[PDB]
Amino acid sequence: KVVDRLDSQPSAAFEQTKQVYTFSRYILGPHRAVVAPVAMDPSEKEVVLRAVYRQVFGNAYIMEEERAELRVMESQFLLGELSVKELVRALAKSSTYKVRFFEGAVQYRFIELCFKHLLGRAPDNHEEIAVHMRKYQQEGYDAEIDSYLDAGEYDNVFGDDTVPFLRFRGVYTPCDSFNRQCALQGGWANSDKAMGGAALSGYNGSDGRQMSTMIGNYISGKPIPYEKVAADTPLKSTAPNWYARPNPALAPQPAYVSAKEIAELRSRVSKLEAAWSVAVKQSAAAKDTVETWRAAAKEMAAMRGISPMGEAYFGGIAQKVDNGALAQLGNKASSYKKYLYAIETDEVSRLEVDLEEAKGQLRVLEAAMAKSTPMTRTAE
Amino acid sequence: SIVTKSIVNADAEARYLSPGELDRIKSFVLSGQRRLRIAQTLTENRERIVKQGGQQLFQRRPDVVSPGGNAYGEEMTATCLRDLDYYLRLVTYGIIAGDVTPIEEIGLVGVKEMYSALGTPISGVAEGIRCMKDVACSLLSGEDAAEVGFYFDYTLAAMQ
Amino acid sequence: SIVTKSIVNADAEARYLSPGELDRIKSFVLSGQRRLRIAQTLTENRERIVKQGGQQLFQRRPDVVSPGGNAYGEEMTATCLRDLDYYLRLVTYGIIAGDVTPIEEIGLVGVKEMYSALGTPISGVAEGIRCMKDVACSLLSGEDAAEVGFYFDYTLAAMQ
Amino acid sequence: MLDAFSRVVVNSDAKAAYVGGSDLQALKSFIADGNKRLDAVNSIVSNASCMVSDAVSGMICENPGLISPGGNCYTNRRMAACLRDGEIILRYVSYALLAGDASVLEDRCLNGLKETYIALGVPTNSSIRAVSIMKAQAVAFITNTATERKMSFAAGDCTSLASEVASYFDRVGAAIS
Amino acid sequence: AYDMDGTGAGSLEPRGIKSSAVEKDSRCFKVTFVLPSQSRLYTFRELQNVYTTKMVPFSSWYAEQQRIQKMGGKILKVELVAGGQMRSVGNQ
Amino acid sequence: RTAYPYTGSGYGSAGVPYGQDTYGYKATTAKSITETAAQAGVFNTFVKLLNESGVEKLVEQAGPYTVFAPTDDAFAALLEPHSFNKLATLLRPENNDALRKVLMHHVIPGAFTSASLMDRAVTVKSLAGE
Amino acid sequence: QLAPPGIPPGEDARNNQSLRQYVARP
Amino acid sequence: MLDAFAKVVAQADARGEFLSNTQIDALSKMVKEGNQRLDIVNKVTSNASAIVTNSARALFAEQPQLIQPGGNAYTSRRMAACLRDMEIVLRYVSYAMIAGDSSVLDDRCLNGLRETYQALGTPGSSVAVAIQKMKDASVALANDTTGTPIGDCSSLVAELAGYFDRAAVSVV
Amino acid sequence: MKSVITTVVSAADAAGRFPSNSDLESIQGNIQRSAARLEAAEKLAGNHEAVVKEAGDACFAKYAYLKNPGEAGENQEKINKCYRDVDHYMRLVNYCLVVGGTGPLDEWGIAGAREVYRTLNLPTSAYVASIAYTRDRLCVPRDMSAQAGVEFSAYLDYLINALS
Numbered sequence A: 001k002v003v004d005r006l007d008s009q010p011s012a013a014f015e016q017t018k019q020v021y022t023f024s025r026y027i028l029g030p031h032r033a034v035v036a037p038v039a040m041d042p043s044e045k046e047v048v049l050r051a052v053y054r055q056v057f058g059n060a061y062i063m064e065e066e067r068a069e070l071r072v073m074e075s076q077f078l079l080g081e082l083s084v085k086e087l088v089r090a091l092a093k094s095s096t097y098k099v100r101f102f103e104g105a106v107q108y109r110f111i112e113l114c115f116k117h118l119l120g121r122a123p124d125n126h127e128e129i130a131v132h133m134r135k136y137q138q139e140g141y142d143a144e145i146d147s148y149l150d151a152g153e154y155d156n157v158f159g160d161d162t163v164p165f166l167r168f169r170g171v172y173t174p175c176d177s178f179n180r181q182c183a184l185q186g187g188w189a190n191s192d193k194a195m196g197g198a199a200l201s202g203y204n205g206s207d208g209r210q211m212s213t214m215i216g217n218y219i220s221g222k223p224i225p226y227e228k229v230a231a232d233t234p235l236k237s238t239a240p241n242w243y244a245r246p247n248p249a250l251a252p253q254p255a256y257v258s259a260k261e262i263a264e265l266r267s268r269v270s271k272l273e274a275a276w277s278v279a280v281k282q283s284a285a286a287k288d289t290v291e292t293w294r295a296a297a298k299e300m301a302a303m304r305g306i307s308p309m310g311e312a313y314f315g316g317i318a319q320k321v322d323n324g325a326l327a328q329l330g331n332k333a334s335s336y337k338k339y340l341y342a343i344e345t346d347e348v349s350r351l352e353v354d355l356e357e358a359k360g361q362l363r364v365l366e367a368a369m370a371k372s373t374p375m376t377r378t379a380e
Numbered sequence B, C: 001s002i003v004t005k006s007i008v009n010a011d012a013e014a015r016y017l018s019p020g021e022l023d024r025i026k027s028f029v030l031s032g033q034r035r036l037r038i039a040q041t042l043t044e045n046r047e048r049i050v051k052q053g054g055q056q057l058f059q060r061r062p063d064v065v066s067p068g069g070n071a072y073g074e075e076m077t078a079t080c081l082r083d084l085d086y087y088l089r090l091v092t093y094g095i096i097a098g099d100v101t102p103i104e105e106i107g108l109v110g111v112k113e114m115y116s117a118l119g120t121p122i123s124g125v126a127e128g129i130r131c132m133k134d135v136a137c138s139l140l141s142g143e144d145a146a147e148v149g150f151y152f153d154y155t156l157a158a159m160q
Numbered sequence D: 001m002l003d004a005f006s007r008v009v010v011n012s013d014a015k016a017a018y019v020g021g022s023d024l025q026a027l028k029s030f031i032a033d034g035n036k037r038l039d040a041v042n043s044i045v046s047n048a049s050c051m052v053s054d055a056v057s058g059m060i061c062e063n064p065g066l067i068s069p070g071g072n073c074y075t076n077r078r079m080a081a082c083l084r085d086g087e088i089i090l091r092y093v094s095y096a097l098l099a100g101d102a103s104v105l106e107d108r109c110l111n112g113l114k115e116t117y118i119a120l121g122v123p124t125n126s127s128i129r130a131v132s133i134m135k136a137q138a139v140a141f142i143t144n145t146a147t148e149r150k151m152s153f154a155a156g157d158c159t160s161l162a163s164e165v166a167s168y169f170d171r172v173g174a175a176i177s
Numbered sequence E: 001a002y003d004m005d006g007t008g009a010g011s012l013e014p015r016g017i018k019s020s021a022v023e024k025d026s027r028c029f030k031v032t033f034v035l036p037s038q039s040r041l042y043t044f045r046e047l048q049n050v051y052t053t054k055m056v057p058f059s060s061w062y063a064e065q066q067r068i069q070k071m072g073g074k075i076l077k078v079e080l081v082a083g084g085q086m087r088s089v090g091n092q
Numbered sequence F: 001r002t003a004y005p006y007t008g009s010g011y012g013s014a015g016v017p018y019g020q021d022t023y024g025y026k027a028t029t030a031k032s033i034t035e036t037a038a039q040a041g042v043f044n045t046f047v048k049l050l051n052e053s054g055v056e057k058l059v060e061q062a063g064p065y066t067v068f069a070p071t072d073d074a075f076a077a078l079l080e081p082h083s084f085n086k087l088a089t090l091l092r093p094e095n096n097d098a099l100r101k102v103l104m105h106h107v108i109p110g111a112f113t114s115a116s117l118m119d120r121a122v123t124v125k126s127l128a129g130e
Numbered sequence G: 001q002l003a004p005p006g007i008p009p010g011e012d013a014r015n016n017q018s019l020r021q022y023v024a025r026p
Numbered sequence H: 001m002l003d004a005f006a007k008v009v010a011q012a013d014a015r016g017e018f019l020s021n022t023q024i025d026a027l028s029k030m031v032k033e034g035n036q037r038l039d040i041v042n043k044v045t046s047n048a049s050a051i052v053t054n055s056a057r058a059l060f061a062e063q064p065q066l067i068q069p070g071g072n073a074y075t076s077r078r079m080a081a082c083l084r085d086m087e088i089v090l091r092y093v094s095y096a097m098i099a100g101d102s103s104v105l106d107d108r109c110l111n112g113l114r115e116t117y118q119a120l121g122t123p124g125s126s127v128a129v130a131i132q133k134m135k136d137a138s139v140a141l142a143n144d145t146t147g148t149p150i151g152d153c154s155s156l157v158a159e160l161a162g163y164f165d166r167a168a169v170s171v172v
Numbered sequence I: 001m002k003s004v005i006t007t008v009v010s011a012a013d014a015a016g017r018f019p020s021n022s023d024l025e026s027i028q029g030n031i032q033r034s035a036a037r038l039e040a041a042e043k044l045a046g047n048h049e050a051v052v053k054e055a056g057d058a059c060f061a062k063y064a065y066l067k068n069p070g071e072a073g074e075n076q077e078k079i080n081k082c083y084r085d086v087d088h089y090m091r092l093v094n095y096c097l098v099v100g101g102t103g104p105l106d107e108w109g110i111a112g113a114r115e116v117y118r119t120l121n122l123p124t125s126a127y128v129a130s131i132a133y134t135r136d137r138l139c140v141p142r143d144m145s146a147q148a149g150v151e152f153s154a155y156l157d158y159l160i161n162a163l164s
């Protein structure tokens, strides 16, 4: 039993943060929970208002000429009768929101943006998308914003005083839906005006189509390609800055590939993962030279004990026996330090590291070979 | 293998094998069935050899297992018998090969550097080999023990 | 000596010594007063440096003097301390000669062959010289105990 | 929220004054007793865990009716919650000691804390006794007169910090009263 | 000590190859060549490998590379693996 | 039975010849900088400039270099409005010294491989001096 | 090395004397 | 006799100038050194007997002609006067170390010491050997930790070596 | 991580402001407090194997029930993986002293430790009886300076506060 409750449930009375957030990517980056305190200074009402305009507009840039329509609902928050969940309801029902994300958007793109902005959650399966389409056609835009917020999910996750954030939930109910979140919040330096093509399709930046890619992955249950999760991603904004020996970062697609060097790489991963299957099996029994004598060497050393440390005279000279737990076994400081160097010393781990350096290189060399007819080649 | 050592001496002279050097191989391959029996009877007595040969090493050198000794503790005496098991393995190679060059290139060249780097008394290692030779030779006839006794004694010389 | 190595090195090229090579001879004869005094301070502490050094060696290596060890018995331990006196005498020659070449030409060329033939553990002779180094280095000043310790560390490196 | 140097600007702004040579005296005393302030905040957050269980368990040993059936520290769900809010109160107190002003203890933590405990059912008279035990420990660590933990300071006296922090604990003892 | 002490024509030492290496120079090349014997058919000595790749010091590359040419050999490649290029001092 | 055998003959070996082909010290198959670039067929403009400017004399030296030669598409990308203002006068037949300083900036002393530069920021001085 | 005889070191009186009235020290 | 602080004031008064802000900060870092300067003076006076009697014992070993009959340090009174001069020079060098200025050392220890040793016939080159033997015996005793916290005393030990060198050239 | 620099650049970037004057002032306090805590990181780098050995057998002398069959010290392989864990916690404290704040102990040594010690049945009192031993062995002028011993015993108590 590792986790005890998910983030879709309310927090228990004995915790500050939730449990699934404590070892997630939540602790590592900017996608955290900003809460408004009980009594707010006007300087720290900006720290809550700049975080709302980050999330709810999805890194769109509100000019001050067009922040002037929001001063009526800003001041109703700065007074203090609109909570954060009621400010974002009126901000979604605004005019500057419907111009940006509704009035040129296909209905798939508007729902997946409302799933990104109001909830911290890319759209999970298909019949959830379908039922949220099937209010707007029957009830209009007005009641459909009450679908996301006036259900159990917003109250259990954000309450009424937290600004929405992209949730790194730990447990994902399809495991595909972790990929959707990384394909939708795709970059710190990105925004939905760019990802939806809403600046290049129109005239001087206005009149854009907010058209969606990855529509077919909603209907047909199909995974996201791994490039859209590893190269322009929240995982690079929340990068752990580890030493990882299989480094997950997507290398740049090279110019000047050749089908010769792909065939040598494709062959050598078959030499490595066939070797891995015959070395994993060989290990766990006969890997250790000093293991068959352990029961014979453990029955030989079990006599001549000195309780008041400083016995074993061996003549009249003195010997300084120490009764530590480690040194009673005959071990040194290098006995526990050997577990740290087993990456370039083990034969089972050297194979697996060398295998996945190669499928890293093969996944980007193959994909650069997906290019065609007028290609100029090289001599290595 | 004497077949290997017998060809390298002929190529150095740049000539075919002499009529005498050919008699070496047929007299060696003739005794192949005998060497397989000798080395095999030692293989079936590993625990009786390396354990008995090891405990006797702890009576003639009680300091290697006392506090401050190299083989003090459960692990250093477990690594203790590991070295003895290596050398009994190499002696069976030399018997089937008819040469000490298997033992020489595996465990005799650079042995003083390895053990000096580990702090292990080389005089205590050869004492365990002299104790394994008595356990080994006691399970074989005098006809065979005098033959296998050379491979044990050859390693003692190089280990000093 | 520093002068000897400069003359033989310039003879292999068949030429005269250069100003850089003559400065090393001037810089060496200037320190002759300090070298003659440091060697005198060690020669006056023979019985303490030797006896003190061999006393600590038998606590870090109690097996060499126990039953079965090389230096077992009064006559053997007497020759035990006799060897430490050889290397203390050689160290005073190196401090005065300006380099370690007397220690090498006397008692370092073939030292591993000598001690392997006598049955003596060479690792114990290097442990006994390291104990004499601590005793001899406790009778000297700040910078005079540093260089004298280098002549004791050279002997141990060449003895392993 | 505010600290010590911002209170003397807020006070000197309703009178439209510059902050000159007279008002700079309470602040030069603040920046010269600064190493004593960090040495007092370090001495409190370094014992923060053991102070709270010292205090909640003292709240039980004097009042056995808190662990009785239906008591407010009955299950493990409720006993752990009482150890949680003890750690929040000591956290917001030690914020105000570091700044030099209770302007952050009184608007984040203490503002609305009393009426929250009424909606839950937390007894206030026993939760006073917890903060009072915590006050006895925080003035014991600052003055280095804890009987079982001697931190190592330079020689001097911190009686004003031991009385600045006692008033911070009495605000918590007066707000939820 | 070095090969360029002025020894040339009309000196007491016989005429030979002179190198431009300093005293105890430490530059080495890496060469590759084939050198047939061209005398085995009247001496009848053993057969030896004539395809060589080895590191040769700067001090001897003029003499070696001039000897391989006299004896019919063919040099297939040469590179400098140790030393600097156009260094004034620091070749020792 | 292993994964990474060791090379060598005789007893205590694995069955792999020394150096994987009995060649302990193998001969150099790689070729010079100026001809390995002319062989690939994409460093056409670059190598032609090294011959016309005179920088080819030091690109062939034995010194370990780390060249950053620009592809032929890079030299064709100089038609940008900005970069053209800076380098359009290098086309004049009298500005050869200015071309040598712009080319010699790509020859770095030392052998920096793409794997040694992983997660490391290094600063050096080009053969031009900057 | 040392000041002249009798002059307390660092406390000379000819320190900043102008040239037009400088007296040479015997 | 004036210390390092009064040396700055004595130069400023002959200019008629106030001390500028770059001179006060050079004096506020002399205060910041402070405790490290008193640690040096404490270490060379606590061992002041051992510095003299070891450097003397090491001076007649190198130069045995000083204590032969006919040497300058052969008798009881001539030997005691030899150890006396070394304690005086070591006393005034520690006065200049606590002051930060060599003014007291050449005011009343070094004025006429060269002409004194020429009158007596004392070999002043051998007196300079004895100052240098006391120098490194106290330099090596300044930069060992032994109850001090770990830090950099490198500029102060270089300052202490300068006073021993000034006394050793003002004697021959 | 969590350093002095990372808190003043992430609070700035949340606001959208350049490095302000109160930012560069806080990095000056990183210059004054530096040599105190870079003096305790070097004392830990050159003497850790003698600290970890002495801190490790304090765990087994205090609780000798661990060496029973069934517990977390039943053989030589688990005992080596015990002294290894003390050398991990001691190496992270050396990383915290070099960075400046509690960056490395949070993300590499705490964030998940409440879970991996429950499933593997590792008792956590046995972890803190090794860390509390080293905090009580600190003789503050002998081992290091007095201000280094504050910076050293601060992360030692930060860790005991997180595991208890």
Ligand SMILES: *CC[C@H]1/C(=C/c2[nH]c(/C=C3N=C(/C=C4\NC(=O)C(CC)=C4C)C(C)=C\3CCC(=O)O)c(CCC(=O)O)c2C)NC(=O)[C@@H]1C
Residues within 6 Å of the ligand: H066, H072, H073, H077, H078, H079, H081, H082, H083, H085, H086, H088, H089, H108, H109, H110, H113, H116, H120, H122, H123, H126, H127, H130
């Ligand atoms: C080991 C030292 C070397 C040495 C010393 C030596 N000195 C003397 C005699 C005198 N020294 C002084 C010195 C001082 N007088 C002062 O007032 C001061 C402070 C300003 C000093 C440092 C004086 C006045 C004398 C002569 C009077 C006396 O006897 O005290 C002597 C004795 C010479 C004699 O003939 O009596 C010795 C031996 N000489 C050496 O050989 C050492 C190298």
Ligand SMILES: *[C@@H](C)[C@H]1/C(=C/C2=NC(=C\c3[nH]c(C[C@H]4NC(=O)C(C=C)=C4C)c(C)c3CCC(=O)O)/C(CCC(=O)O)=C2C)NC(=O)[C@@H]1C
Residues within 6 Å of the ligand: D032, D033, D034, D035, D036, D038, D039, D040, D042, D142, D143, D144, D153, D154, D155, D156, D157, D158, D161, I033, I146, I147, I150
């Ligand atoms: C009262 C609680 C104590 C006490 C306090 C004193 N502390 C004094 C000096 C002091 N404390 C520190 C560490 C502090 N400064 C920092 O920068 C940080 C963290 C980043 C901390 C925790 C320092 C550096 C100093 C200065 C002395 C030193 O160099 O170690 C102090 C002296 C007064 C002063 O210097 O201002 C006092 C009185 N002392 C006590 O005895 C009670 C119990």
Ligand SMILES: *[C@@H](C)[C@H]1/C(=C/C2=NC(=C\c3[nH]c(C[C@H]4NC(=O)C(C=C)=C4C)c(C)c3CCC(=O)O)/C(CCC(=O)O)=C2C)NC(=O)[C@@H]1C
Residues within 6 Å of the ligand: H034, H035, H036, H038, H039, H040, H042, H142, H143, H144, H145, H148, H149, H150, H151, H152, H153, I145
């Ligand atoms: C260089 C000689 C040493 C070294 C010296 C340091 N000492 C430091 C502080 C310090 N020094 C003293 C000695 C001195 N001060 C006095 O008041 C008296 C007696 C009246 C003496 C003899 C004291 C008392 C102190 C304590 C000051 C304090 O800590 O408050 C010091 C700086 C401390 C630090 O930064 O850690 C240094 C560097 N240290 C060395 O490594 C060499 C060997």
Ligand SMILES: *[C@@H](C)[C@H]1/C(=C/C2=NC(=C\c3[nH]c(C[C@H]4NC(=O)C(C=C)=C4C)c(C)c3CCC(=O)O)/C(CCC(=O)O)=C2C)NC(=O)[C@@H]1C
Residues within 6 Å of the ligand: I056, I059, I066, I072, I073, I078, I079, I081, I082, I083, I085, I088, I089, I108, I109, I116, I120, I122, I123, I124, I126, I127
């Ligand atoms: C000995 C005094 C301890 C003890 C230790 C054991 N730990 C075991 C496994 C283990 N420990 C950790 C945490 C550790 N690894 C890290 O990388 C870091 C920080 C960088 C830390 C603190 C992990 C992740 C694991 C599992 C993987 C592994 O083997 O390292 C362990 C083995 C238990 C088992 O195999 O069932 C032991 C015995 N046990 C004790 O009794 C005290 C608490």
Ligand SMILES: *[C@H](C)[C@H]1/C(=C/C2=NC(=C\c3[nH]c(C[C@H]4NC(=O)C(C=C)=C4C)c(C)c3CCC(=O)O)/C(CCC(=O)O)=C2C)NC(=O)[C@@H]1C
Residues within 6 Å of the ligand: A024, A025, A168, A169, A170, A171, A172, A173, A174, A175, A178, A240
């Ligand atoms: C353990 C046996 C593996 C291993 C696992 C790691 N997984 C890490 C993050 C992570 N793991 C999952 C899988 C799981 N979570 C789910 O929600 C679902 C399905 C609904 C599954 C199967 C996911 C989706 C994620 C990413 C989500 C997140 O991080 O919040 C992880 C941490 C990596 C990191 O911090 O960068 C590890 C180490 N790793 C192993 O070595 C063994 C083989």
Ligand SMILES: *[C@H](C)[C@H]1/C(=C/C2=NC(=C\c3[nH]c(C[C@H]4NC(=O)C(C=C)=C4C)c(C)c3CCC(=O)O)/C(CCC(=O)O)=C2C)NC(=O)[C@@H]1C
Residues within 6 Å of the ligand: A012, A013, A014, D056, D072, D073, D077, D078, D079, D081, D082, D083, D085, D086, D088, D089, D108, D109, D113, D116, D120, D122, D123, D126, D127, D130
């Ligand atoms: C312990 C000394 C008390 C006690 C505490 C209980 N509190 C319970 C719930 C609860 N506690 C707080 C206080 C805390 N949260 C904050 O945000 C702040 C200030 C910033 C503080 C001090 C709150 C707000 C709540 C309710 C909401 C929540 O739990 O998150 C609680 C649980 C009651 C239950 O299980 O029904 C307990 C037992 N109770 C006691 O008897 C002593 C006196």
Ligand SMILES: *[C@H](C)[C@H]1/C(=C/C2=NC(=C\c3[nH]c(C[C@H]4NC(=O)C(C=C)=C4C)c(C)c3CCC(=O)O)/C(CCC(=O)O)=C2C)NC(=O)[C@@H]1C
Residues within 6 Å of the ligand: G014, G015, G016, G017, G018, G019, G020, G022
């Ligand atoms: C400068 C690049 C020279 C140089 C000259 C030095 N002069 C020193 C002292 C000094 N200078 C003067 C002449 C000065 N006083 C005036 O009133 C006028 C003109 C109106 C001038 C040029 C005098 C009279 C004196 C002595 C009085 C005094 O000490 O102030 C001097 C210090 C000498 C010393 O203390 O022994 C120097 C070093 N300095 C150089 O290095 C080059 C040669």
Ligand SMILES: C=CC1=C(C)[C@@H](Cc2[nH]c(/C=C3N=C(/C=C4\NC(=O)[C@H](C)[C@H]4CC)C(C)=C\3CCC(=O)O)c(CCC(=O)O)c2C)NC1=O
Residues within 6 Å of the ligand: D047, D050, D051, D054, D055, D057, D058, D060, D061, D062, D133, D136, D137, D140, D141, D145, D146, D147, D148, D149
């Ligand atoms: C019925 C149960 C019961 C208890 C548990 C104690 C709890 C307790 N401790 C103190 C008093 C104190 N309590 C602590 C707390 C601690 N001491 C430490 O060193 C640790 C950090 C921490 C325990 C983990 C401290 C430091 C003092 C001050 C005196 C001292 O211990 O040095 C006080 C108030 C003052 C007093 O009574 O004198 C109380 C109620 N008393 C009880 O009646």
Ligand SMILES: C=CC1=C(C)[C@@H](Cc2[nH]c(/C=C3N=C(/C=C4\NC(=O)[C@H](C)[C@H]4CC)C(C)=C\3CCC(=O)O)c(CCC(=O)O)c2C)NC1=O
Residues within 6 Å of the ligand: I043, I044, I047, I048, I050, I051, I054, I137, I138, I139, I140, I141, I142, I143
């Ligand atoms: C990383 C920081 C760090 C430390 C704190 C020490 C911790 C430590 N201290 C000692 C060793 C010691 N420590 C002390 C100190 C004391 N004993 C007392 O009774 C007094 C209360 C206290 C003075 C403050 C003494 C006297 C010894 C030597 C005797 C002993 O080992 O107990 C040893 C044994 C090896 C040694 O001598 O150093 C170790 C590991 N080492 C470190 O590397």
Ligand SMILES: CCC1=C(C)/C(=C/C2=NC(=C\c3[nH]c(/C=C4\NC(=O)[C@H](C)[C@H]4CC)c(C)c3CCC(=O)O)/C(CCC(=O)O)=C2C)NC1=O
Residues within 6 Å of the ligand: A289, B064, B065, B070, B071, B072, B076, B077, B079, B080, B081, B082, B083, B084, B086, B087, B090, B106, B107, B118, B120, B121, B122, B123, B124, B125, B128
């Ligand atoms: C087949 C050729 C061959 C040999 C012999 C060999 C020996 C060998 N002996 C070792 C250690 C050791 N060897 C000994 C040996 C001894 N202690 C004593 O008291 C005796 C004098 C002596 C004989 C038992 C000990 C105690 C260790 C462990 C040292 C340590 O753990 O630090 C080790 C290091 C650990 C390991 O086994 O990987 C090697 C490699 N390797 C080889 O390839």
Ligand SMILES: CCC1=C(C)/C(=C/C2=NC(=C\c3[nH]c(/C=C4\NC(=O)[C@H](C)[C@H]4CC)c(C)c3CCC(=O)O)/C(CCC(=O)O)=C2C)NC1=O
Residues within 6 Å of the ligand: C064, C065, C070, C071, C072, C076, C077, C079, C080, C081, C082, C083, C084, C086, C087, C106, C107, C108, C118, C120, C121, C123, C124, C125, C128
């Ligand atoms: C100047 C260079 C030099 C050296 C070093 C030297 C050594 C030397 N050591 C000898 C014996 C010996 N050496 C030792 C030495 C030791 N026993 C121990 O336990 C220690 C580990 C070790 C060092 C103290 C012993 C015990 C003997 C006598 C051996 C015997 O009698 O069986 C002998 C034979 C007897 C003699 O002639 O004295 C020589 C010649 N000769 C030289 O010319």
Ligand SMILES: CCC1=C(C)/C(=C/C2=NC(=C\c3[nH]c(/C=C4\NC(=O)[C@H](C)[C@H]4CC)c(C)c3CCC(=O)O)/C(CCC(=O)O)=C2C)NC1=O
Residues within 6 Å of the ligand: E018, E019, E020, E021, E058, E061, E062, E065, E066, E085, E086, E087
């Ligand atoms: C008989 C056929 C043959 C030739 C010609 C030959 C040349 C030859 N020239 C060399 C060097 C050299 N050659 C020169 C030559 C010149 N510098 C200039 O500025 C001029 C352009 C040029 C004179 C025309 C220099 C300066 C070196 C030394 C290079 C250095 O030390 O870096 C070396 C390296 C070894 C040594 O210098 O001793 C060889 C082997 N070897 C042969 O087997």
